[PDB]
């Protein structure tokens, strides 16, 4: 009945200070237990950052991260924070807040924080047209490019088309913007008769794009 | 001449599981009718003994252990169980002869904003022996680095409190537990049921 | 810093199998070892602490053993829900250290990918950049190699690829690779090809197109 919720931007520039907040519901931090932070770079292992005692405030940090990290419990709000100075590309990771350091039993869902020089930017959606009538079932999709804040949602035909869909994980380009593709496998026969629209929503900006993908 | 079962079940105050109370009962007739006539018990499990034999048999001494745990921990008050409560707070023997009774006490043991009076032992070097009561509050050394009686690295206070809120889920709500143990030593037996 | 390593680091198994995952420490850590299960898009869940103590609410088919510098995790009668990534953690010294993680995926008959190549859209070209996308669809063995060829020159350094998680229905993987240039650089070369190597193919399969055709 204790829940952890990370909060904070996924938008931090190199050499700046990353700031995250963990909201605790169902238990008062100062009453007991110990609380800390864990991070995981995309596609890599987990790393321990630090933890503190709710009752006493006794705080410990990873020696490799000391002089950069600070964890403190806010007063009269039942949450604790994480501050990481002078971040670099090595600090891009999914950050978790967790309870009971020695045996991390309760976790927050985690928030992805990407370190990059880019600001919030909506994507450009370019079609990936089919060219077959190649395989018994053709492949088509959408290219979602140049959006920095990672959260992006892709659906097909306003959620009607789900079978055969493959929305790929985004990749961080050298420019500091993300880019992904969403593809769907459809029968060769439906090409030019069945309308295929990919619905892309980028909530961090106010971007809503619907792109009609057609044969070229 | 009746056994003081009401003093245990209807007690206003209940102990924390790590410091569980034990009431020794002797020199009385034991009215178990009041117990299973009720419909307020979510758990009533009897091992090696039955209410019929409870009605007729006599025992040298019977013990009534009482404590508070959360909802989904009641399964741990049983022979051959593992977990934080069974291993570190209250262990029953594999040959346990007695009955386990538990009921939801969300109305009593939960407070708006959370009731933190009830504690449990989260860390211990070894498992509790059957019917062992460990009330130690020494700092727990989780790793190799030593704790000098202080909250050093990887060192934690062994006792942690339940955050009993009224709106908690059922498995996390407070449950009052009473465990009856019946022992028959080779001595005259002073605890007898009505059917004797 | 005590360095933790996991030997398998990847393996495949079928439902009802028994598997063993090995995690080692760079020095003695007694039994200060934790085992965690992490599924994609989710936080890890604690499975075993003190190297043998199974957490409450975890099925008994999970079991841990070991001491000193070597530990093992064993799963019996493998169930569909048991397929995830598993991590180990040591809490012996000041930096808590995790292992790299070991990924277990469902064993399945070998399936070759169906390869598709997509030339840049005219709208993107009008925007000054050109992206060439190669798609690999429904290949069971996750490991595959994609080689971009431009005018028969092996192109490395200007492509990025991404792989979906194992499909819950067909138990296959899908890969997407993107080769990005400027419009001017795109117009410098005529032939764009995507060469795919995979266990399901006896010889590499190449999908190509000629710019402007
Ligand atoms: C004492 O406990 C018995 C057993 O359920 C119950 O019948 C009785 O009403 C209780 N009395 C009080 C005052 O709580």
Numbering used by the authors:
A (entry chain H): 1 to 35, 35A, 36 to 52, 52A, 53 to 82, 82A, 82B, 82C, ...
B (entry chain I): 334 to 529
C (entry chain L): 1 to 213
Can you provide the manuscript's text about this entry?
Here we describe the antibody response induced by the SARS-CoV-2 Spike Ferritin Nanoparticle (SpFN) vaccine candidate adjuvanted with the Army Liposomal Formulation including QS21 (ALFQ) in non-human primates. By isolating and characterizing several monoclonal antibodies directed against the Spike Receptor Binding Domain (RBD), N-Terminal Domain (NTD), or the S2 Domain, we define the molecular recognition of vaccine-elicited cross-reactive monoclonal antibodies (mAbs) elicited by SpFN. In the case of SpFN-elicited RBD-targeting mAbs, we divided them into two broad epitope categories targeting either (i) the hACE2-binding site (Group A RBD mAbs, associated with class I), or (ii) a conserved cryptic site (Group B RBD mAbs, associated with class III/V). We structurally characterized the SARS-CoV-2 WA-1 RBD in complex with WRAIR-5021 and WRAIR-5001, which represent RBD competition Groups A and B, respectively.
To understand the structural basis of RBD recognition by these mAbs, we crystallized Group A WRAIR-5021 Fab in complex with the SARS-CoV-2 RBD and analyzed the structure at a final resolution of 2.3 Å. Structure determination confirmed that WRAIR-5021, which potently neutralizes SARS-CoV-2 targets the hACE2 binding site with a distinct epitope centered on the hACE2 binding ridge loop (residues 475-478 and 484-490). WRAIR-5021 forms extensive interactions across the entire length of the receptor binding motif, with a BSA of 1221.6 Å2 with heavy and light chains contributing 61.9% and 38.1% of the total BSA, respectively. Heavy and light chain interactions form a total of 13 and 9 hydrogen bonds, respectively, with the light chain forming three additional salt-bridge interactions. WRAIR-5021 heavy chain contacts are mediated by all the CDR loops with CDR H1 contributing the most, covering >300 Å2 of the RBD interface. Major heavy chain contacts are formed by a set of Tyr residues in the CDR H1 and H2 (residues Tyr27, Tyr33, Tyr34, and Tyr51). Based on this analysis, we confirmed that WRAIR-5021 can be classified as a class I mAb. However, based on the structure modeling, none of these mutations, including those found in the Delta variant, would offer enough steric/electrostatic clashing to prevent RBD binding by WRAIR-5021, suggesting a molecular mechanism for the in vivo protection against Delta challenge. Structure superimposition demonstrated that despite a few minor clashes, the binding of WRAIR-5021 is compatible with both the up and down conformations of S protein, indicating accessibility of the epitope on the Spike trimer. Group A RBD WRAIR-5021 conferred 100% in vivo protection against body weight loss and lethal challenge (P < 0.0001).
